[PDB]
Amino acid sequence: IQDSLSSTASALGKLQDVVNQNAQALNTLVKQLSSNFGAISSVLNDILSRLDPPEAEVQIDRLITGRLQSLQTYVTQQLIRAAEIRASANLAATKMSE
Amino acid sequence: YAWNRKRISNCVADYSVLYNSASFSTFKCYGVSPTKLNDLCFTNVYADS
């Protein structure tokens, strides 16, 4: 067993998949900040520093809607993944005890 | 039909004077509010007359 672990690299794919899934979800969430969502620009500071009040509320609102949707999707994915991991952890606790 | 395009670059533009000049009957800006023009930097400005 020691030799197999020391040589083969795909043994811990189960944990590597969890790490990769979480990292990839975070990367997607962060990248979502770079989308216009229909606004003139994807940078809040640029929108504020170019347009004036009354105006630019449309742009800010478009960005808000897009980013809120992105966050909601990410949180739903995290909730489902957490449910799956909790099932796995309960299985592991049962395995330990028995 | 033969509108003339003038190039503007490598200078400092004080748009406050133009905005305050009441001689301009129509002064509409779309991508930027006229007031904010004094605190922005552009790659280059095209003038068509």
Resolution in A: 3.0
Nearest Cα to Cα of residue A63 among A79, A47, A77:
A47
Please judge whether B33 and A55 are an interchain contact, meaning their C-beta atoms are less than 8 angstroms apart: yes
Instruction: Compare all CA atoms of chain B with the CA of A46 and give the residue at the minimum distance.
Output: B40
CA dist B42 and B48 (Å) reads 17
User: 47-66 in A: which are within 8 Å (CB) of B?
Assistant: 49-52, 55-56
Q: Which residues 6+ apart lie within 8 Å of A63 measured at CB?
A: A37, A39, A42, A44, A47
CA dist A63 and A52 (Å) reads 16
